[PDB]
Design an enzyme around this catalytic site. Structure first.
Site, PDB file in Angstrom:
ATOM      1  N   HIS A  15      -4.587 -34.253 -13.051  1.00 47.74           N
ATOM      2  CA  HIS A  15      -4.045 -32.968 -13.585  1.00 47.74           C
ATOM      3  C   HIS A  15      -2.747 -33.231 -14.333  1.00 47.74           C
ATOM      4  O   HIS A  15      -2.478 -32.568 -15.331  1.00 47.74           O
ATOM      5  CB  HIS A  15      -3.805 -32.004 -12.416  1.00 47.74           C
ATOM      6  CG  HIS A  15      -5.046 -31.719 -11.625  1.00 47.74           C
ATOM      7  ND1 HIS A  15      -6.140 -31.048 -12.181  1.00 47.74           N
ATOM      8  CD2 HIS A  15      -5.370 -31.994 -10.341  1.00 47.74           C
ATOM      9  CE1 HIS A  15      -7.051 -30.905 -11.235  1.00 47.74           C
ATOM     10  NE2 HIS A  15      -6.647 -31.506 -10.152  1.00 47.74           N
ATOM     11  N   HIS A  32       6.915 -34.038 -12.173  1.00 48.93           N
ATOM     12  CA  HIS A  32       5.814 -34.179 -13.114  1.00 48.93           C
ATOM     13  C   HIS A  32       6.077 -33.306 -14.317  1.00 48.93           C
ATOM     14  O   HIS A  32       7.084 -32.582 -14.344  1.00 48.93           O
ATOM     15  CB  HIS A  32       4.511 -33.744 -12.461  1.00 48.93           C
ATOM     16  CG  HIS A  32       4.495 -32.329 -12.019  1.00 48.93           C
ATOM     17  ND1 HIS A  32       5.000 -31.943 -10.783  1.00 48.93           N
ATOM     18  CD2 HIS A  32       4.223 -31.192 -12.709  1.00 48.93           C
ATOM     19  CE1 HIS A  32       4.934 -30.602 -10.743  1.00 48.93           C
ATOM     20  NE2 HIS A  32       4.459 -30.110 -11.880  1.00 48.93           N
ATOM     21  N   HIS A  56       4.104 -30.847 -17.610  1.00 53.24           N
ATOM     22  CA  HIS A  56       2.972 -30.160 -18.267  1.00 53.24           C
ATOM     23  C   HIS A  56       3.200 -30.257 -19.769  1.00 53.24           C
ATOM     24  O   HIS A  56       4.378 -30.143 -20.185  1.00 53.24           O
ATOM     25  CB  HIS A  56       2.810 -28.694 -17.850  1.00 53.24           C
ATOM     26  CG  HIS A  56       2.795 -28.506 -16.372  1.00 53.24           C
ATOM     27  ND1 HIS A  56       1.612 -28.372 -15.675  1.00 53.24           N
ATOM     28  CD2 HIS A  56       3.794 -28.476 -15.459  1.00 53.24           C
ATOM     29  CE1 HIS A  56       1.899 -28.207 -14.368  1.00 53.24           C
ATOM     30  NE2 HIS A  56       3.232 -28.338 -14.230  1.00 53.24           N
ATOM     31  N   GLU A  66       4.872 -24.161 -19.535  1.00 49.55           N
ATOM     32  CA  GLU A  66       4.304 -23.121 -18.661  1.00 49.55           C
ATOM     33  C   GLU A  66       5.163 -21.870 -18.742  1.00 49.55           C
ATOM     34  O   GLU A  66       4.670 -20.846 -19.198  1.00 49.55           O
ATOM     35  CB  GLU A  66       4.245 -23.675 -17.250  1.00 49.55           C
ATOM     36  CG  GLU A  66       3.257 -24.839 -17.174  1.00 49.55           C
ATOM     37  CD  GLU A  66       2.618 -25.032 -15.819  1.00 49.55           C
ATOM     38  OE1 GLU A  66       3.341 -25.137 -14.810  1.00 49.55           O
ATOM     39  OE2 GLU A  66       1.367 -25.039 -15.778  1.00 49.55           O
ATOM     40  N   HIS A 121       8.938 -30.485 -14.173  1.00 49.93           N
ATOM     41  CA  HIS A 121       9.075 -29.816 -12.870  1.00 49.93           C
ATOM     42  C   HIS A 121       9.565 -30.838 -11.855  1.00 49.93           C
ATOM     43  O   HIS A 121       8.808 -31.758 -11.525  1.00 49.93           O
ATOM     44  CB  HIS A 121       7.710 -29.240 -12.467  1.00 49.93           C
ATOM     45  CG  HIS A 121       7.335 -28.042 -13.237  1.00 49.93           C
ATOM     46  ND1 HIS A 121       6.020 -27.526 -13.279  1.00 49.93           N
ATOM     47  CD2 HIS A 121       8.100 -27.305 -14.057  1.00 49.93           C
ATOM     48  CE1 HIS A 121       6.049 -26.507 -14.107  1.00 49.93           C
ATOM     49  NE2 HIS A 121       7.300 -26.303 -14.587  1.00 49.93           N
ATOM     50  N   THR A 177       2.102 -23.446  -9.881  1.00 51.69           N
ATOM     51  CA  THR A 177       1.397 -23.083 -11.117  1.00 51.69           C
ATOM     52  C   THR A 177       0.031 -23.726 -11.192  1.00 51.69           C
ATOM     53  O   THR A 177      -0.627 -23.557 -12.207  1.00 51.69           O
ATOM     54  CB  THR A 177       2.208 -23.475 -12.354  1.00 51.69           C
ATOM     55  OG1 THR A 177       2.273 -24.906 -12.408  1.00 51.69           O
ATOM     56  CG2 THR A 177       3.590 -22.842 -12.388  1.00 51.69           C
ATOM     57  N   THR A 178      -0.372 -24.445 -10.166  1.00 53.83           N
ATOM     58  CA  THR A 178      -1.749 -24.987 -10.030  1.00 53.83           C
ATOM     59  C   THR A 178      -2.309 -24.486  -8.714  1.00 53.83           C
ATOM     60  O   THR A 178      -1.544 -24.131  -7.801  1.00 53.83           O
ATOM     61  CB  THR A 178      -1.795 -26.514  -9.976  1.00 53.83           C
ATOM     62  OG1 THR A 178      -1.232 -26.976  -8.749  1.00 53.83           O
ATOM     63  CG2 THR A 178      -1.086 -27.197 -11.123  1.00 53.83           C
TER      64      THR A 178
HETATM   65  N1  LIG Z   1       3.551 -27.097 -11.069  1.00 55.92           N
HETATM   66  S1  LIG Z   1       4.239 -26.889  -9.698  1.00 55.92           S
HETATM   67  O1  LIG Z   1       5.561 -27.525  -9.740  1.00 55.92           O
HETATM   68  O2  LIG Z   1       4.151 -25.495  -9.257  1.00 55.92           O
HETATM   69  C1  LIG Z   1       3.401 -27.761  -8.559  1.00 55.92           C
HETATM   70  C2  LIG Z   1       3.986 -28.590  -7.578  1.00 55.92           C
HETATM   71  C3  LIG Z   1       3.289 -29.326  -6.630  1.00 55.92           C
HETATM   72  C4  LIG Z   1       1.920 -29.165  -6.479  1.00 55.92           C
HETATM   73  C5  LIG Z   1       1.161 -30.010  -5.478  1.00 55.92           C
HETATM   74  O3  LIG Z   1       1.297 -31.220  -5.607  1.00 55.92           O
HETATM   75  N2  LIG Z   1       0.273 -29.488  -4.642  1.00 55.92           N
HETATM   76  C6  LIG Z   1       0.196 -28.153  -4.288  1.00 55.92           C
HETATM   77  C7  LIG Z   1       0.527 -27.945  -2.835  1.00 55.92           C
HETATM   78  N3  LIG Z   1      -0.482 -28.652  -2.039  1.00 55.92           N
HETATM   79  C8  LIG Z   1      -0.417 -30.106  -2.368  1.00 55.92           C
HETATM   80  C9  LIG Z   1      -0.614 -30.423  -3.878  1.00 55.92           C
HETATM   81  C10 LIG Z   1      -2.120 -30.253  -4.269  1.00 55.92           C
HETATM   82  C11 LIG Z   1      -2.284 -30.692  -5.715  1.00 55.92           C
HETATM   83  C12 LIG Z   1      -2.443 -32.055  -5.975  1.00 55.92           C
HETATM   84  C13 LIG Z   1      -2.523 -32.498  -7.329  1.00 55.92           C
HETATM   85  C14 LIG Z   1      -2.500 -31.568  -8.352  1.00 55.92           C
HETATM   86  C15 LIG Z   1      -2.324 -30.221  -8.077  1.00 55.92           C
HETATM   87  C16 LIG Z   1      -2.212 -29.737  -6.756  1.00 55.92           C
HETATM   88  C17 LIG Z   1       1.277 -28.345  -7.409  1.00 55.92           C
HETATM   89  C18 LIG Z   1       2.002 -27.651  -8.375  1.00 55.92           C
HETATM   90 ZN   LIG Z   2       4.293 -28.228 -12.478  1.00 60.65          ZN
END
Ligand SMILES: NS(=O)(=O)c1ccc(C(=O)N2CCNC[C@H]2Cc2ccccc2)cc1
Ligand SMILES: [Zn+2]
Length: 259
Positions: free
Chosen positions: A63, A93, A95, A105, A118, A197-198
């Site tokens: 992603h 990371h 976007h 975003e 982010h 946001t994912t």
């Molecule tokens: N874009 S954001 O900063 O809102 C963001 C931050 C972290 C995550 C994250 O790494 N997540 C969300 C919370 N559960 C674990 C993991 C799952 C994930 C792994 C890889 C890609 C996306 C989501 C997703 C989005």
């Molecule tokens: Zn992000």
């Protein structure tokens, strides 16, 4: 297995079917209407303490790519601003777009930037990241816009390792990277309560979005666009346009740290 992503068939307009909170009351990102955001003279300056940051690894997760940190102690923390307590840096990371006119975003008066960084932090009162994402004040994500112009020297070590993590599931050692080299001069920000946001789109984030974008070169962002969403030995699908568009603000106020 038809999982979420950023394509026509599995992109943001589809996410609500597996993740109904996609249509929730505090979804991210949002458009930042600079005229409607109110100066909040009671917000404290942000405290970004990244001097002891320990980067470990860089991962292509299908992603985006994540630069991961040792968050087993208070080494790199975010405090102050709208935050209560201590938020530990776990990863950053980006976007980004297929073209320089899109990729961020958050938007600012409907302006899209070429990319958005982010820096993800979790509230140490919840003990681990997995517990923090279940709480309304679990995460603090520091968002920084990227515009195309002059190179960002502090980004180049990231750009130069991307060839080694081209495809989904690839990681590489990534020690001694200093995320202070990604910050703009000013820490002036907007802040509002929102979400990941994912998927799983959990409503656990205090968003802190810096006013001042960083400049990166066309060559730097072109190297982001050579990554792949796919695994090794799968048909090439360039990792571009991995951004969720702006979601309804609903019953929220965006606060500015600055006049
Ligand atoms: N874009 S954001 O900063 O809102 C963001 C931050 C972290 C995550 C994250 O790494 N997540 C969300 C919370 N559960 C674990 C993991 C799952 C994930 C792994 C890889 C890609 C996306 C989501 C997703 C989005
Ligand atoms: Zn992000």
């Amino acid at each position: 297995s038809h999982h979420w992503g950023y394509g026509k068939h599995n992109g943001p307009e589809h996410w609500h079917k597996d993740f109904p909170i996609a249509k929730g009351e505090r979804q991210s990102p949002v458009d930042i209407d600079t005229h409607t955001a109110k100066y909040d003279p009671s917000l404290k300056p942000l405290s970004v303490s990244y001097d002891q940051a320990t980067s470990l690894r860089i991962l292509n997760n299908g992603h985006a790519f994540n630069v991961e940190f040792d968050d087993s102690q208070d080494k790199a923390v975010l405090k102050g601003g709208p935050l209560d307590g201590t938020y530990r840096l776990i990863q950053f990371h980006f976007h980004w777009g297929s073209l320089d006119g899109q990729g961020s975003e958050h938007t600012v008066d409907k302006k899209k930037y070429a990319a958005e960084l982010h820096l993800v932090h979790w509230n140490t009162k919840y003990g681990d990241f997995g517990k923090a994402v279940q709480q309304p004040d679990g995460l603090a994500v520091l968002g920084i816009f990227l515009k195309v112009g002059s190179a960002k020297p502090g980004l180049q070590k990231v750009v130069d390792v991307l060839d080694s993590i081209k495809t989904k599931g690839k990681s590489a050692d990534f020690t001694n990277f200093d995320p202070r080299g990604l910050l703009p001069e000013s820490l002036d920000y907007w802040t509002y309560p929102g979400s990941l946001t994912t998927p799983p789109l959990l409503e656990c984030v205090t968003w802190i979005v810096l006013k001042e974008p960083i400049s990166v070169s066309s060559e730097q962002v072109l190297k982001f666009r050579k990554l792949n969403f796919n695994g090794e030995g799968e048909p090439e699908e360039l990792m571009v346009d991995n951004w969720r568009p702006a979601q309804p603000l609903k019953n929220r106020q965006i606060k500015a740290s600055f006049k």
